[PDB]
Amino acid sequence: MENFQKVEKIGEGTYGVVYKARNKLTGEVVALKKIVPSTAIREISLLKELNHPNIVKLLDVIHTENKLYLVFEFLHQDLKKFMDASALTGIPLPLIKSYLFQLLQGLAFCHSHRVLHRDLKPQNLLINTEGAIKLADFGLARAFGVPVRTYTHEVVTLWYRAPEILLGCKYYSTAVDIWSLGCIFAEMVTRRALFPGDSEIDQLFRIFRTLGTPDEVVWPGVTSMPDYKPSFPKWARQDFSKVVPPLDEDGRSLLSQMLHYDPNKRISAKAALAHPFFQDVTKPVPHLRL
Numbered sequence: 001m002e003n004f005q006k007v008e009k010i011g012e013g014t015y016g017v018v019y020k021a022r023n024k025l026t027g028e029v030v031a032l033k034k035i036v037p038s039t040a041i042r043e044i045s046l047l048k049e050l051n052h053p054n055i056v057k058l059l060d061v062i063h064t065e066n067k068l069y070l071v072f073e074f075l076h077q078d079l080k081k082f083m084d085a086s087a088l089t090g091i092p093l094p095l096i097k098s099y100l101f102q103l104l105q106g107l108a109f110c111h112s113h114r115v116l117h118r119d120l121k122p123q124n125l126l127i128n129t130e131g132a133i134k135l136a137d138f139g140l141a142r143a144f145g146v147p148v149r150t151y152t153h154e155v156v157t158l159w160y161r162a163p164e165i166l167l168g169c170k171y172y173s174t175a176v177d178i179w180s181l182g183c184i185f186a187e188m189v190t191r192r193a194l195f196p197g198d199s200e201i202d203q204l205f206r207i208f209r210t211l212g213t214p215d216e217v218v219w220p221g222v223t224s225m226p227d228y229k230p231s232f233p234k235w236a237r238q239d240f241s242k243v244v245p246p247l248d249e250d251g252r253s254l255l256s257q258m259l260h261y262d263p264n265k266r267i268s269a270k271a272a273l274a275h276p277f278f279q280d281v282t283k284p285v286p287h288l289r290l
């Protein structure tokens, strides 16, 4: 750590404080994250080779005095702040499309190596002045787990959590990240969180209120999941035209596939990249204020 000069505290992450820092050597500007069981060390070590343009680069791992620090490529802003800043007029559709397209490329790459994110949310989708967007903290969930509260006691959001996780599935798949991304896609379009749950049951019931209470027809096996209760109220499914106006038919079709209840039926990142919604995709340069 003596090799870094902390510039400023940028946030309180799930696992510890996050700082903008400078390498006292290469003068490099990086993000430094404070987080050790050998298993965690090995899992994180593997992430050093999981490199792709849409995945924030893991530069190094420092394990000293029995403390763990992760050094990442630095990006100036996150999607949460960009969305709040674009609340008045909303993010232009071409830019939402470009961001979704890029995030799907990031997921397709990691998923092809069987690595999941598991806790995708706007706060960990980072953007630069070139029109790129990247996934931060990929793979950390398997290495360290996803706690109920962060190190500073802040509630870890449930808003983007897949229903199979909420229903107690033990071995969820790469489909969980597609669900989260679909929730983020809808939020960029409407300028409001899709399912802003404030407890596990509120999260589930908000999902059911929009997509209908899942049953054996739409999700074979659902009634046998650990946290499924036959006493759940039965809500009817809303039309997507009501859920995400003014998204076009291509967008609504893709969203609806990203939010399928059955994880085995939910669209993959690779399939989503081939969807007609991306026919006219471009790479606009957003207006950033650093």
Ligand SMILES: Clc1cccc(-c2cc(NCc3ccncc3)n3nccc3n2)c1Cl
Binding pocket: 010, 011, 012, 013, 014, 018, 031, 056, 072, 073, 074, 075, 076, 077, 078, 123, 124, 126, 136
């Ligand atoms: Cl708290 C938290 C949670 C998840 C990811 C992050 C977080 C945020 C950024 N940059 C965005 C940013 C820059 C300056 N001030 C605020 C944000 N980065 N940049 C590389 C890793 C990283 N992780 C952070 Cl800070």
